[PDB]
C-alpha cells in the first residue's frame, strides 16, 4: 500500500506570505502521479496540481508544485485571502489521499468574550435543561472550557462546537453546551463556566444563580 502523509497539520500564516505544504509518500510514487487539491468549507475539492508539477488552466500561478520519489511540495508564492483553506494531496498511479493540511490566517492574540446562558422556561415545560457557555471571537483556536456545578467538576455531560475562522476579523467562536435532566437540577443551584486561554492571564469564570 502507498501511504501519503501531509505536513504540517495546521499552518498559520499572514496574507502575503510564502506557503509551503509537504506530502511524504511511504514508498515511491510511480511516474510522479501526485496531485494537489484545495477545499473550503461547504464546497467540493478543487484540483490545483497534477503530475506533481503541472497546473491546470484557470488555476492561479501563485500555486506551484514540485518534488519526486517520496517527497512532494506545494508552494503558494504569496497567500491570498481565498487561499486559506484545507489542502489534500492524492496518489493515483488504488488511489489514496493525505490526511489534509489546513492553512489558517495567523493574527493577533485575542481573548474570548465569555457569556453564559440560563435554561429558558419553554425548555423547562418539556423537562430538560441546557446551559450554554459562549466564547466569542478569540484567537488562537485552542481554548479550554470547564463546567462547574456548585464548584464540582463535570465530565461527559457537555458537547462543544467551534465555528470556522471568521472572514473579517479571523477569530473563532466556541459554544459548549452542558445538558442534563431536571433531576440533577433543581438538585443543584449555582452554575458556572471557567475558561482557560492564551489571551487570558488568568482563567475567566462566568456564573448565574438558578431562578435568580
Amino acid at each position: 500500500e502507498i501511504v501519503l502523509t501531509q505536513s504540517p497539520g495546521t499552518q498559520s500564516l499572514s496574507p502575503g506570505e510564502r506557503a509551503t505544504l509537504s506530502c511524504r509518500a511511504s514508498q515511491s510514487v510511480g511516474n510522479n502521479k501526485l496531485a494537489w487539491y484545495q477545499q473550503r468549507p461547504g464546497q467540493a475539492p478543487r484540483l490545483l496540481i497534477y503530475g506533481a508539477s503541472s497546473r491546470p488552466s484557470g488555476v492561479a500561478d501563485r500555486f506551484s508544485g514540485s518534488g519526486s520519489g517520496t517527497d512532494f511540495t506545494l508552494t503558494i508564492s504569496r497567500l491570498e485571502p481565498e487561499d486559506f483553506a484545507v489542502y489534500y494531496c492524492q496518489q493515483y498511479g488504488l488511489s489514496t489521499f493525505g490526511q489534509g493540511t489546513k492553512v489558517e490566517v495567523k493574527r493577533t492574540v485575542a481573548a474570548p468574550s465569555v457569556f453564559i446562558f440560563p435554561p429558558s422556561d419553554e425548555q423547562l415545560k418539556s423537562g430538560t435543561a441546557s446551559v450554554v457557555c459562549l466564547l466569542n471571537n478569540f484567537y488562537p483556536r485552542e481554548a479550554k472550557v470547564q463546567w462547574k456545578v456548585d464548584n464540582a467538576l463535570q465530565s461527559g455531560n457537555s458537547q462543544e462546537s467551534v465555528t470556522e475562522q471568521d472572514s473579517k476579523d479571523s477569530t473563532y467562536s466556541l459554544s459548549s453546551t452542558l445538558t442534563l435532566s431536571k433531576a440533577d437540577y433543581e438538585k443543584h443551584k449555582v452554575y458556572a463556566c471557567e475558561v482557560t486561554h492564551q489571551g487570558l492571564s488568568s482563567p475567566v469564570t462566568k456564573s448565574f444563580n438558578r431562578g435568580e
Binding site: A35, Y37, F97, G100, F115, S120
Partner: protein
C-alpha cells in the same frame, strides 16, 4: 465546460442500501474515468472507486470491496454508485469526480487527477426519525450577546437567520450529534446593550427535511 450534477440528499437506516447518481453534462462521457470520493463530517477525503463508462472497467478501494457497486449508463450520460449494508460511519458527503483532459476538447488525453467535481450528496445513516426542531431562546443577561437554541431535530441541515435576513455579529454554530441521535445547534449574535429593551430580535429557523418553520422572538427576559 464539463458539468456534474448529483442527486439529492438521502437518509438511510443501518443495513439498508443507497444509490447516488451523477449526471455528466458536457465533454465526452464514454472515454474518461468517473471516480467516487466520500468525506465523513470533519474528516479527510477517501477514494472509493472508479469506472470508465465504456468497457465497463471498475476499480474499488479494498475497504469497500463487495459492499459497493459502480455503474455507467452511456444512454443518459449518468454514473451510479450503490452502497449496501450501510452503517452510521458511512454517513458522509459523497462526491462524484471526472478526470481532466488535455490536448483538444473532448478529443483529449486523460491526466488521472480529478479536474471536475459534483456538488456532492449528503448521505445520513441513522436509526432516527425525521423530527422538527424545538427552538428555545437564549435570552440576554456596551455589548451584549443573545441567541436561539435549535434543539432535537433530524436530520441535517437546519438554517437560521435573524430578523428575516436583516447579519452583523451573527454566529451560527455547527450542529453536534447528541447521544439521543438527534442534532442540536446554537446561534448567537452580539448587539449593543442599549438596544435590547427597545429592539425586536427574531430568529428564523427553517428545517426543510421535516417541513418545519419557526420564527422565535428573543426579547429581554425579566424577573
Amino acid at each position: 465546460q464539463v458539468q456534474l450534477v448529483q442527486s439529492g440528499a438521502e437518509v438511510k437506516r443501518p443495513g439498508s442500501s443507497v444509490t447516488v447518481s451523477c449526471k455528466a453534462s458536457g465533454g465526452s462521457f464514454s472515454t474518461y474515468a468517473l471516480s467516487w470520493v466520500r468525506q465523513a463530517p470533519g474528516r479527510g477525503l477517501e477514494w472509493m472507486g472508479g469506472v470508465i463508462p465504456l468497457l465497463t472497467i471498475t476499480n474499488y478501494a479494498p475497504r469497500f470491496q463487495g459492499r459497493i457497486t459502480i455503474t455507467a449508463d452511456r444512454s443518459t450520460s449518468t454514473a451510479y454508485l450503490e452502497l449496501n449494508s450501510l452503517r452510521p460511519e458511512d454517513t458522509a458527503v459523497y462526491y462524484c469526480a471526472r478526470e481532466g483532459t488535455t490536448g483538444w476538447g473532448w478529443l483529449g488525453k486523460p491526466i488521472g487527477a480529478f479536474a471536475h467535481w459534483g456538488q456532492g450528496t449528503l448521505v445520513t445513516v441513522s436509526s432516527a426519525s425525521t423530527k422538527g426542531p424545538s427552538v428555545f431562546p437564549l435570552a440576554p443577561s456596551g455589548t451584549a450577546a443573545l441567541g436561539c437554541l435549535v434543539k432535537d431535530y433530524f436530520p441535517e441541515p437546519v438554517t437560521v437567520s435573524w430578523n428575516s435576513g436583516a447579519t452583523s455579529g451573527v454566529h451560527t454554530f455547527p450542529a453536534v450529534l447528541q447521544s439521543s441521535g438527534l442534532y442540536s445547534l446554537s446561534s448567537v449574535v452580539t448587539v449593543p446593550s442599549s438596544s435590547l429593551g427597545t429592539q425586536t430580535y427574531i430568529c428564523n429557523v427553517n428545517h426543510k427535511p421535516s417541513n418545519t418553520k419557526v420564527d422565535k422572538k428573543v426579547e429581554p427576559k425579566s424577573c
